[PDB]
């Protein structure tokens, strides 16, 4: 009820997580399949707060929040092991969910002339999408994406295949 | 050599044991098979004829080569914006090969210490040469295949250095003639320009946007399992597919099931199809005005 | 039946434990030898009477007892990767004729490489010091590891194989001391030849100060450069080097002395393209009609590699036609078209000098 009147947004981003997770048998009957993941963005108000709502209404299996900056580190190759091993964890956690904020920091696309530059950023994000493009599971763990700006296009052209349900704010009625 | 088995203070070796190493590097991927096959995709019959050529002709038809004196292809470049869906292509037909198959992720070769990826790739091609014939598939080569320009510094200079070491395994040493290795890249923007060769990247195929025939075909393959009310044009929405990726046709099906739920209708309808089309593409919103 | 008992009696001799390796630093007396283990600790021990004291010498690989920690047996030298640097194999010889061009480069490296070995007299008479080094670079064209490879399997004698990715070493860049020891065994098996593939990475500039890797790489480079700045005679050892771009190699390598000669591959002329096309038309069975000037007119600016892949593309396109002997019309079609696809993917082939 802390939502500010946004309904179609909260309805879609709700049925995309609760309904498949609360009543899995429903889709298995009608299957078809529910989408892999979602996307949120727009002006700051209100980002990341509807995420807190997903925390509240969250019933059983825990979900893992992931801030954007902890991916990028110096001494390259660290955030890669990171994202990989947290995916292995989520594959241990049986139907647990992941959320990403500030993805626009780590998904900067595409490149520059040189010398880079994006090369660590690229290998981390493209590595993320690489983990996303393996056939298994993937992931039965959903995902969640909330940011400010919709750019950049490389993760945004890699999402619509796996991910879906891009919804925009709205903003005060 | 190494690994020779010796017991503590004995400093004598009872048995010489193989083979090699190591954990994640030893087994990056051991694939049983993915269930999908080439029959699940459509519109690629020409380029999948080129693929099925490059992979299948060394397996069964090697005798034909030795009759004609033919050098088979090795590197085969795979590029296009998703989708396409070239990963289901390569891994589907990889499950149709029955030969040994190893998946691999491009950025995996980026490592913590200097040139770990080198011994990594050498171990990979060593177990590949052991399992010969075999197939190794890598993606996002352009992530590790950006040579940059000039010092300093390329943090991947060791990784791309290992790529040039793959060009040495394709250059100064012939034995890679067995176990064809396939590569895929979403964007051909940055490359090692030396990657052009038959042992290196040879058959190079652009994967375009699917065509309305192929779009309605493959989307019909995604919806063929689900209950559909037997009124669908596939022509109407095939033309309503503009700039779509086949993956966004999948999203059209997935959304068809989504609002098919909230409708309460037990079976899918065409208004649902065009609905989901409008849903995923193109975006939103503004308002209806000024155009009357 | 009795041979088994011979083996079992060998086990009775295996009840003797392996000894511990070490080096000879100095010797304080005849009963005091200043030694060090390969693992780092230093010791002073006497020894038995089976030694020859003068034969000991400082800087000597020896084996020590497990308790007395003293020399019983010794061996002069050992190196693991060497025999693997010698285990490279290449066919040809005849490939040295198969490569076509480039003639003046072929004969040039034949002179500066092979001639100091067989004929030091010609050089020592005129007063000229023999060049100890050379450089190759593609792919402005290609054929580096081919040409030089058939020089290693051509001249034979003693030759050493090096990939730049084996000097990585992870901890403690002692792959540097593997360059030192490697040069010492090149001073053992001399005359020897040294390959260097992909010398850009192990040739970098350290332009921007950064991280760790670049610094220790530059450290092994200091080892290289100062071992070509000798203090040593490298007359008897040969060094061949190949890399994409002769840019990041630093003025130290670009300086003569260390690197005397500079030779490149260029895009093959339609004459050499003609020739390499000839030798690539040999192994492939063809129809009675053959015209090479068709492909020579059509194919322009390819690498020699791109040209042989063009021939293979002709034949493997001709497995669709299922004909054993194949016309060169199918070769004009598939060669022409797919070759021009290679030229659409030929982006950014233009390299420095
Ligand atoms: N529509 C709304 N309904 C309920 N609360 C709102 C709404 N808009 C703003 N708020 C309140 O305003 C505060 C600020 O919004 P918030 O900080 O969550 O967005 P944000 O985190 O800045 O978005 P972003 O993550 O894109 O920066 C929140 O604590 C929230 O309670
Ligand atoms: N032409 C097509 N034929 C069949 N399926 C397709 C086609 N185009 C898209 N798809 C579907 O789109 C989905 C997403 O696949 P995607 O395009 O991400 O694979 P990909 O692009 O090869 O992988 P990557 O993104 O690593 O290159 C797949 O499940 C696939 O079934
Ligand atoms: N002049 C030539 N004659 C015969 N074959 C050639 C010639 N030039 C290139 N090739 C072919 O190119 C392939 C690779 O050998 P080469 O040493 O040229 O690789 P490279 O120069 O390291 O390639 P790149 O410079 O593109 O990395 C060989 O199979 C060889 O048949």
């Amino acid at each position: 009820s802390d939502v500010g009147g946004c309904k179609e947004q909260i309805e879609k981003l709700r049925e995309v997580v609760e309904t498949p997770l609360l009543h899995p048998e429903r889709f298995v009957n009608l299957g078809i399949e529910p989408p892999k993941g979602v996307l949120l963005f727009g002006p700051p108000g209100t980002g990341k707060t509807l995420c807190a709502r997903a925390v509240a209404n969250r019933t059983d299996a825990c979900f893992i929040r992931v801030i954007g900056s902890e991916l990028v580190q110096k001494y390259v190759g660290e955030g890669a092991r990171m994202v990989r091993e947290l995916f292995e964890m989520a594959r241990t956690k049986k139907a647990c969910l992941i959320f990403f904020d500030e993805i626009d920091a780590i998904g900067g696309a595409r490149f520059d002339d040189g010398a880079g530059g994006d090369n660590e950023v690229q290998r981390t994000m493209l590595e993320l999408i690489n983990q996303l493009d393996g056939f298994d599971p993937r992931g039965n763990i959903k995902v969640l994406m909330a940011t400010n700006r919709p750019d950049t296009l490389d993760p945004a052209l890699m999402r619509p295949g796996r991910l879906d349900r891009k919804i925009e704010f709205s903003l005060p009625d | 050599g190494d690994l020779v088995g010796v017991n503590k203070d004995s400093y004598l070796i009872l048995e010489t044991l193989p083979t090699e190493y190591d954990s994640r590097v030893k087994a990056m991927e051991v694939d049983e098979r993915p269930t999908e096959q080439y029959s699940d995709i459509g519109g690629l019959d020409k380029q999948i004829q080129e693929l099925v050529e490059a992979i299948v002709l060394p397996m069964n038809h090697k005798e034909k080569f030795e009759n004609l004196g033919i050098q088979p292809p090795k590197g085969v470049l795979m590029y296009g914006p998703p989708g396409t869906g070239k990963t289901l292509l390569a891994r589907a037909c990889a499950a149709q090969t029955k030969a040994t198959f190893l998946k691999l992720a491009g950025p995996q070769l980026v490592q913590m210490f200097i040139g770990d990826g080198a011994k990594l790739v050498r171990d990979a091609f060593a177990l590949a040469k052991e399992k010969a014939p075999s197939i190794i598939f890598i993606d996002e080569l352009d992530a590790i295949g950006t040579k940059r320009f000039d010092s300093e510094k390329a943090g991947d200079r060791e990784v791309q250095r290992t790529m040039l070491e793959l060009l040495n395994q394709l250059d100064g040493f012939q034995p890679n003639t067995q176990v064809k290795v396939i590569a895929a890249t979403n964007r051909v923007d940055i490359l090692d320009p030396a990657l052009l060769r038959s042992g290196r990247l040879d058959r190079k195929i652009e994967f375009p946007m699917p065509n309305e025939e192929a779009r309605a075909r493959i989307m019909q393959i995604h919806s063929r399992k689900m209950n559909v009310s037997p009124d669908v044009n596939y022509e109407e929405l095939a033309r309503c597919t503009d700039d779509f990726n086949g993956a966004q046709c999948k999203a059209v099906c997935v959304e068809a099931g989504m609002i098919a739920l909230r409708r309460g209708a037990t079976e899918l309808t065409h208004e649902d199809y065009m609905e989901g089309i409008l849903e995923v593409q193109a975006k939103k919103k503004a308002n209806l005005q000024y155009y009357a | 039946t009795k041979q088994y008992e011979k083996s079992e009696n060998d086990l009775k001799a295996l009840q003797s434990v392996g000894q511990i390796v070490g080096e000879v630093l100095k010797q304080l007396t005849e009963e005091k030898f200043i030694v060090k283990a390969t693992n780092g600790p230093r010791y002073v021990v006497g020894c038995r009477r089976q030694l020859d004291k003068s034969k000991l010498k400082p800087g000597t690989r020896v084996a020590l007892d497990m308790t007395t920690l003293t020399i019983m047996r010794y061996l002069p030298r050992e190196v693991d990767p060497l025999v693997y640097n010698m285990s490279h194999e290449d066919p040809g010889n005849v490939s040295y004729s198969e490569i076509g061009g480039l003639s003046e480069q072929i004969r040039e490296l034949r002179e500066v490489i092979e001639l100091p070995l067989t004929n030091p007299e010609l050089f020592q008479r005129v007063g000229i010091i023999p060049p100890k080094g050379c450089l190759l670079y593609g792919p402005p064209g290609t054929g580096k590891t081919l040409l030089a490879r058939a020089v290693a399997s051509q001249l034979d004698c003693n030759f050493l194989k090096v990939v730049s990715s084996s000097i990585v070493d992870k901890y403690i860049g002692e792959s540097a001391r593997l360059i030192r020891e490697m040069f010492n065994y090149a001073r053992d098996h001399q005359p020897c030849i040294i390959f260097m593939d992909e010398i850009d990475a192990i040739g970098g500039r350290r332009f921007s100060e950064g991280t760790s890797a670049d610094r220790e790489i530059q450290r092994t480079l200091m080892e290289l450069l100062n071992q070509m700045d000798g203090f040593d005679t490298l007359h008897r050892v040969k060094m061949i080097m190949a890399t994409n771009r002769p840019d990041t190699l630093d003025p130290a390598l670009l300086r003569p002395g260390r690197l005397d000669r500079k030779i490149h591959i260029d895009l093959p002329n339609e004459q050499a393209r003609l020739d390499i096309l000839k030798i690539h038309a040999g192994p492939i069975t063809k129809h009675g009609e053959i015209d090479y000037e068709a492909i020579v007119k059509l194919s322009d600016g390819f690498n020699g590699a791109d040209l042989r892949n063009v021939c293979t593309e002709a034949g493997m396109f001709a497995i669709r036609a299922d004909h054993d002997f194949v016309v060169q019309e199918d070769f004009m079609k598939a060669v022409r078209k797919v070759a021009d696809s290679k030229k659409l993917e030929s982006k950014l082939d233009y390299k420095p000098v």
Side-chain angles (χ1 to χ4, degrees), chain C residues 225-242:
Chain C
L225 301 162
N226 188 22
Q227 291 168 127
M228 300 173 288
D229 290 333
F231 287 173
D232 185 31
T233 169
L234 302 182
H235 67 295
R236 219 166 156 75
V237 66
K238 301 308 289 183
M239 47 207 69
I240 302 302
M241 310 167 184

Side-chain angles (χ1 to χ4, degrees), chain A residues 36 129-130 133 135 158 161-162, chain B residues 40-44 80-89 137 139-140 184-186 208 210 214 218 222 245-248 250:
Chain A
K36 271 77 173 177
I129 299 302
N130 201 332
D133 296 332
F135 287 172
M158 295 315 299
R162 182 168 183 287
Chain B
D40 302 348
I41 67 109
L44 291 63
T84 314
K86 44 190 183 306
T87 315
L88 284 77
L89 174 49
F137 169 80
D139 203 351
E140 304 88 14
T185 54
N186 285 325
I218 59 108
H222 311 136
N245 287 334
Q248 302 172 327
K250 278 201 76 57

Side-chain angles (χ1 to χ4, degrees), chain A residues 15 26-27 31-33 35 75 81 84 110-111 113-116 119 123 130 135 158 161 164-166, chain B residues 36 88 105-108 112-113 140 142 148-149 156 186-187 189 226 247 253-255 261-262 279-280:
Chain A
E15 69 182 343
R26 190 173 303 170
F27 287 157
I32 214 67
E33 172 72 19
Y75 192 79
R81 299 178 53 208
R84 292 165 48 189
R110 185 50 174 78
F111 63 97
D113 295 343
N119 301 131
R123 66 183 69 110
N130 201 332
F135 287 172
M158 295 315 299
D164 199 9
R165 195 58 66 181
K166 42 179 181 183
Chain B
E36 79 284 340
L88 284 77
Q108 294 289 109
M112 169 175 282
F113 290 146
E140 304 88 14
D142 56 345
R148 293 196 183 192
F149 292 145
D156 275 341
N186 285 325
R187 194 168 167 185
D189 51 337
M226 338 304 168
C253 196
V254 178
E255 186 70 20
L261 179 72
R262 57 161 69 97
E279 167 78 8
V280 290

Side-chain angles (χ1 to χ4, degrees), chain C residues 280-291:
Chain C
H280 276 316
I284 172 62
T285 179
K286 301 171 299 296
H287 186 88
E289 185 272 337
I290 42 81
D291 175 69

Side-chain angles (χ1 to χ4, degrees), chain B residues 205-244:
Chain B
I205 316 172
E206 190 276 339
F207 294 165
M209 169 188 175
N211 286 333
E212 50 281 359
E213 307 86 358
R215 290 191 298 265
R217 281 194 176 282
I218 59 108
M219 194 208 55
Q220 188 175 357
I221 306 304
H222 311 136
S223 53
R224 64 183 277 271
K225 172 194 305 308
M226 338 304 168
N227 294 279
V228 176
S229 58
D231 180 20
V232 176
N233 309 123
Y234 293 112
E235 189 281 332
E236 169 62 20
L237 48 82
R239 178 66 178 174
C240 279
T241 60
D242 296 320
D243 300 340
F244 290 12

Side-chain angles (χ1 to χ4, degrees), chain A residues 21-160:
Chain A
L21 160 72
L22 178 52
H23 300 121
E25 188 271 336
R26 190 173 303 170
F27 287 157
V28 175
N29 191 341
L30 193 55
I32 214 67
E33 172 72 19
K36 271 77 173 177
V38 306
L39 173 64
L40 298 173
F41 63 112
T46 178
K48 201 171 51 65
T49 294
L50 303 185
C51 310
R53 181 212 165 279
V55 192
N57 281 116
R58 190 67 191 82
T59 169
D60 295 339
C62 64
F63 73 94
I64 310 309
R65 77 168 169 82
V66 174
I67 47 189
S69 188
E70 271 304 316
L71 279 68
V72 295
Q73 290 170 344
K74 281 317 177 176
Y75 192 79
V76 294
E78 289 176 353
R81 299 178 53 208
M82 185 185 297
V83 63
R84 292 165 48 189
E85 68 201 0
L86 64 81
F87 286 151
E88 183 73 16
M89 286 182 64
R91 294 171 187 174
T92 308
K93 301 295 284 188
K94 58 166 186 185
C96 155
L97 271 38
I98 313 291
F99 162 69
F100 301 87
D101 188 18
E102 288 182 344
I103 180 186
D104 53 345
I106 59 104
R110 185 50 174 78
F111 63 97
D112 299 338
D113 295 343
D118 292 340
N119 301 131
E120 50 178 347
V121 184
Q122 282 314 290
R123 66 183 69 110
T124 47
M125 53 161 284
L126 292 169
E127 175 224 5
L128 158 68
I129 299 302
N130 201 332
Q131 304 288 111
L132 261 68
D133 296 332
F135 287 172
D136 302 338
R138 201 192 194 274
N140 207 347
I141 52 100
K142 212 180 64 71
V143 280
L144 213 170
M145 293 293 193
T147 180
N148 183 32
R149 314 176 171 85
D151 59 336
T152 54
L153 272 67
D154 193 75
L157 69 91
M158 295 315 299
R159 56 158 180 93

